[PDB]
Amino acid sequence: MRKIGIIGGTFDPPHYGHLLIANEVYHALNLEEVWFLPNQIPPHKQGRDITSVESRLQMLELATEAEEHFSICLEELSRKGPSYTYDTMLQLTKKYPDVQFHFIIGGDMVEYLPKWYNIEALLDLVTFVGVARPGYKLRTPYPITTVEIPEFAVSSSLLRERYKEKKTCKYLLPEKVQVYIERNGLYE
Amino acid sequence: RKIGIIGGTFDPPHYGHLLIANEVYHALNLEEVWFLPNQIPPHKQGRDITSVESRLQMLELATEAEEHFSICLEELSRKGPSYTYDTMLQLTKKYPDVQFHFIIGGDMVEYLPKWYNIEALLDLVTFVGVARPGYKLRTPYPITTVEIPEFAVSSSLLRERYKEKKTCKYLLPEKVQVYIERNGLYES
Numbered sequence: 001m002r003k004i005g006i007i008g009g010t011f012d013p014p015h016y017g018h019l020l021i022a023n024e025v026y027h028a029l030n031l032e033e034v035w036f037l038p039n040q041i042p043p044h045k046q047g048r049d050i051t052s053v054e055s056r057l058q059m060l061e062l063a064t065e066a067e068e069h070f071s072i073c074l075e076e077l078s079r080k081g082p083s084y085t086y087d088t089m090l091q092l093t094k095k096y097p098d099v100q101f102h103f104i105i106g107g108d109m110v111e112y113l114p115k116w117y118n119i120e121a122l123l124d125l126v127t128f129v130g131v132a133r134p135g136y137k138l139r140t141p142y143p144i145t146t147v148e149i150p151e152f153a154v155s156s157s158l159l160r161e162r163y164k165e166k167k168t169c170k171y172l173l174p175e176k177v178q179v180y181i182e183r184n185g186l187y188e
Numbered sequence: 189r190k191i192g193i194i195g196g197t198f199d200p201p202h203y204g205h206l207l208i209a210n211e212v213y214h215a216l217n218l219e220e221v222w223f224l225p226n227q228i229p230p231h232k233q234g235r236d237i238t239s240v241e242s243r244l245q246m247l248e249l250a251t252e253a254e255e256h257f258s259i260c261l262e263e264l265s266r267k268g269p270s271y272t273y274d275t276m277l278q279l280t281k282k283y284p285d286v287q288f289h290f291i292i293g294g295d296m297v298e299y300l301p302k303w304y305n306i307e308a309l310l311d312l313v314t315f316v317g318v319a320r321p322g323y324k325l326r327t328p329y330p331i332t333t334v335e336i337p338e339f340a341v342s343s344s345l346l347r348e349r350y351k352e353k354k355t356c357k358y359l360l361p362e363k364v365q366v367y368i369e370r371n372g373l374y375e376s
């Protein structure tokens with residue numbers, strides 16, 4: 001099953017920018033499917049806070065369950081420590097020898113690439129697909145694939161701020177995710 | 189009474205229309221927002237546009253679920269080209285109760301110098317600009333601004349995409365999608 005997309009994330013919370021870039025890359029590159037890959041500990045944001053894996057997982061399920069071309073990969077949640085993508089992609093490449101993985105990143109992560117653990121070796125394990133994001137730019141010296149989408153400036157940190165400040169989040173993320181955030185008072 | 193007006197052609201209406209309407213309604217504590225479809229757009233005369241009953245059908249589908257959104261049918265009676273200045277004269281005289289906030293995206297912010305009776309219009313109504321990717325709010329005119337999570341969705345892209353059978357997931361409401369697809373709008 002050759003062409004598979006994988007979107008790595010903290011998903012804190014998941015939102016329409018995640019679903020948008022996943023669906024757009026899926027159509028653009030004729031992928032068989034897209035795997036959402038939630039991290040246990042974000043390797044670049046190790047000191048911080050972040051909501052439980054359990055609530056992040058539940059949001060992600062809510063966010064993606066409608067979608068049959070979407071599924072959740074738990075490889076990192078079954079590992080201790082910071083979730084380095086090179087380690088994960090090593091495991092998945094050997095578990096799935098007949099898949100060409102396309103790792104999907106937004107503009108801000110394309111810029112941060114030079115600081116990823118084992119970046120140069122990672123680029124040989126996987127095909128990176130960068131997608132534009134307002135305020136970031138897709139220019140990178142690394143040989144990545146690029147897909148054009150209708151850019152959406154929603155972020156997880158913006159959503160967290162707005163929930164705290166009691167500001168509207170309508171049209172920013174799935175209604176099912178909104179329902180769960182408000183029920184459990186995450187981000188207030 | 190602070191009331192929003194978003195004039196547009198709505199061919200089709202999409203999440204960018206709904207987003208900006210919601211964003212200003214909350215940021216300016218509006219009582220509600222009116223969607224004002226034009227009979228003939230002043231600046232796209234002839235062009236190639238969808239019928240007014242069809243655009244009206246879609247706009248209803250786009251906004252029906254929304255309690256704080258109604259549609260204003262003022263431009264739909266009489267003449268051809270819908271000049272906003274005339275509309276707002278008529279609305280201002282009719283409801284001296286209400287302070288109208290006319291909502292425009294950044295592309296329409298840019299084109300303001302070419303609007304009919306622009307200077308007299310600015311005296312009539314409060315303009316509210318919202319950013320659009322690929323158009324920052326630079327204007328020498330004294331308009332009110334609200335900061336939004338920008339979405340690069342456009343009507344012409346959706347037209348093009350429907351014609352090419354490309355995905356429109358997350359870009360516009362499902363009810364509107366159902367209508368376009370079933371009547372085979374925008375194809376060829």
Ligand SMILES: Nc1ncnc2c1ncn2[C@@H]1O[C@H](COP(=O)(O)OP(=O)(O)OC[C@H]2O[C@@H]([n+]3cccc(C(=O)O)c3)[C@H](O)[C@@H]2O)[C@@H](O)[C@H]1O
Nearest residue numbers: 008009010011017044084085105106109116117133152154
């Ligand atoms: N509005 C939007 N438009 C376009 N793209 C958008 C977006 N919002 C988020 N995104 C993108 O979606 C993805 C998920 O966002 P978010 O949930 O915040 O994810 P984030 O915490 O930024 O992490 C992104 C991925 O990169 C991995 N990473 C980062 C840094 C170093 C290393 C390493 O191994 O050394 C690995 C991390 O483990 C995860 O797999 C990101 O790629 C982000 O850029």
Ligand SMILES: Nc1ncnc2c1ncn2[C@@H]1O[C@H](COP(=O)(O)OP(=O)(O)OC[C@H]2O[C@@H]([n+]3cccc(C(=O)O)c3)[C@H](O)[C@@H]2O)[C@@H](O)[C@H]1O
Nearest residue numbers: 195196197198204230231271272292293296303304320339
């Ligand atoms: N993604 C996005 N992000 C931010 N804003 C977005 C947007 N997509 C549409 N918009 C905005 O939504 C609104 C509606 O979109 P669209 O259907 O394409 O509307 P459009 O045809 O641009 O018309 C905008 C309004 O301006 C009026 N106008 C235009 C030119 C001259 C004059 C005149 O009186 O001489 C009047 C026109 O009759 C209509 O009422 C527009 O303001 C557009 O800029």
Ligand SMILES: [Mg+2]
Nearest residue numbers: 106108109155
């Ligand atoms: Mg990020």
Ligand SMILES: [Mg+2]
Nearest residue numbers: 293295296342
């Ligand atoms: Mg426009």
